C-alpha cells in the first residue's frame, strides 16, 4: 500500500479456482480462498496462491482454444473504504508484485518467442 501513512483500510484478496463464471460480488468471493489485509504499520501482504490443479504440472501457456480460464482468478476487493484524514490525497495506490513460492518448479524448455526484438 503506497498511500499515505495516515490511511486506514482493509482489502479482501480472493483467489477463486476455475468456476464457470468469474466471481464479482464480494459475497461470491468471500466463499473462495481469501484473506483480509489490514493497512497499518507494516505495508505489504504476500498472498500465496495455492496450487490447486488435477495435473501435477500445469501448462504455462494457455494459448489454446479458450474458455473461462483455469487456473481461476485473483481479485482484490476493497472491504471497508479507505478512511483518510482531511488534507490527504484521494485515491491511493496499491503497488502489486508477483514472485514465485518456495516450491515453484519449472519443466521442459521450449523455443522462446523472439518477438522482443522487432
Amino acid at each position: 500500500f503506497c498511500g499515505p501513512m495516515m490511511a486506514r483500510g482493509k482489502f479482501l484478496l480472493s483467489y477463486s479456482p476455475p468456476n464457470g463464471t468469474q466471481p464479482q460480488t464480494l459475497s461470491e468471493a468471500m466463499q473462495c480462498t481469501y484473506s483480509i489485509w489490514d493497512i497499518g504499520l507494516n505495508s505489504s501482504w504476500t498472498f500465496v496462491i495455492p496450487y490447486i490443479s488435477p495435473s501435477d504440472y500445469r501448462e504455462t501457456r494457455a494459448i489454446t482454444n479458450s474458455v473461462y480460464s483455469a487456473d481461476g482468478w485473483f481479485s482484490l476487493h476493497k472491504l471497508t473504504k479507505i478512511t483518510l484524514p482531511p488534507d490527504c490525497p484521494q485515491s491511493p495506490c496499491i503497488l502489486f508484485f508477483a514472485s514465485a513460492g518456495e516450491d515453484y518448479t519449472l519443466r521442459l524448455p521450449v523455443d522462446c518467442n523472439p518477438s522482443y526484438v522487432f
Partner: protein
C-alpha cells in the same frame, strides 16, 4: 502474510504460511544454468568463401572499399554487425539496393533467458550446411587474432593462406557437418551480456565490449581460386554453451502489449 516489501527482501512463502496446506514436491531441475544453455541453437547463416578474402575493415567504412562481407561469423550472443561486435541490433525492414546490406546477428534464444549480466561458458560449434552436397571447411581464429588474407601460388594455383594455420581448420566430408568445442579464449574473465563501460578503442563508444566473443569462424571451399564457382553457397552455424556459469542477475527483454 504481514511483510515489508520496502525492505527489498521478501521471503518466498508457501501455502502453509497463511493457510492450511502443504509443500509440493520438487518437480525437476531444468532451470539449472548449466543445463539450460547446454543445447544447440542457430546463430548466423554465413556465406562460404571461394577465394582469399578481405576481412571487413573497421568502422566507419567508406564507399569503394572492395571487401568481403557476410562471410565471417563473430561467435557471440551479443548483437553484431558486419562480422564485428555492435551494441544495437538492426534488421532491414525494406532493404532497398542502395549500399551494402550488413549481415547482423543475435542469439534470440539467449537474451529471452539472459536474466544475468556476466556469462562464461565453453562453446560447441556445429556448422550445418544449407546446400545439397557441399564439401566445405570451417576455419577459425581466436578472440584477439586477425584473418590471414592473401594467397600463395602452389603449382600455378592460388591456394589462399586460410587453408593452413595454427588454429583449427576442420574439413568436412561431402554431405557432412563440422562439430568441435571451443574453449573460453577471450582475455576478459567473463562475457558481459550487458556492458556499461566504454571501450577505449577506435573512437570510444559506451556499452560496447571489445573482447566479448569466442572467436570468429568462416566457411571456405577447399579448392584454389582458379576453381571458383558462380552461385553463392550458404552455411548455418549452430552453437551450444558447454559448462555455462552465470553471475549477477538482471532483466529480461520488454515484451510489448500491442
Amino acid at each position: 502474510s504481514t511483510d515489508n516489501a520496502e525492505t527489498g527482501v521478501i521471503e518466498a512463502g508457501n501455502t502453509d504460511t497463511d493457510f492450511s496446506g502443504e509443500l509440493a514436491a520438487p518437480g525437476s531441475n531444468h532451470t539449472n544454468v548449466k543445463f539450460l544453455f547446454d543445447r544447440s541453437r542457430l546463430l548466423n547463416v554465413i556465406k562460404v568463401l571461394e577465394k582469399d578474402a578481405v576481412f571487413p575493415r573497421p568502422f566507419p567504412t567508406a564507399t569503394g572499399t572492395q571487401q568481403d562481407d557476410g562471410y565471417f561469423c563473430l561467435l557471440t550472443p551479443r548483437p553484431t554487425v558486419a562480422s564485428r561486435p555492435a551494441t544495437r541490433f538492426g534488421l532491414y525492414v525494406s532493404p532497398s539496393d542502395s549500399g551494402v546490406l550488413a549481415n547482423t546477428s543475435l542469439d534470440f534464444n539467449f537474451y529471452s533467458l539472459a536474466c544475468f549480466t556476466y556469462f562464461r561458458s565453453d562453446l560447441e560449434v556445429t556448422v550445418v550446411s544449407l546446400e545439397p552436397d557441399l564439401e566445405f571447411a570451417v576455419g577459425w581464429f581466436p578472440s584477439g587474432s586477425e584473418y590471414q588474407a592473401s594467397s600463395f601460388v602452389y603449382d600455378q594455383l592460388h591456394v589462399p593462406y586460410h587453408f593452413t594455420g595454427r588454429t583449427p581448420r576442420a574439413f568436412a566430408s561431402k554431405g557432412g557437418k563440422v562439430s568441435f568445442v571451443l574453449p573460453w579464449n577471450s582475455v576478459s574473465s567473463v562475457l558481459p551480456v550487458r556492458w556499461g563501460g566504454a571501450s577505449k578503442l577506435s573512437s570510444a563508444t559506451r556499452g560496447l565490449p571489445a573482447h566479448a566473443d569466442w572467436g570468429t569462424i568462416y566457411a571456405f571451399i577447399p579448392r584454389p581460386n582458379e576453381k571458383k564457382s558462380t552461385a553463392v553457397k550458404h552455411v548455418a552455424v549452430y552453437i551450444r554453451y558447454k559448462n555455462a556459469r552465470a553471475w549477477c542477475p538482471s532483466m529480461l527483454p520488454f515484451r510489448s502489449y500491442k
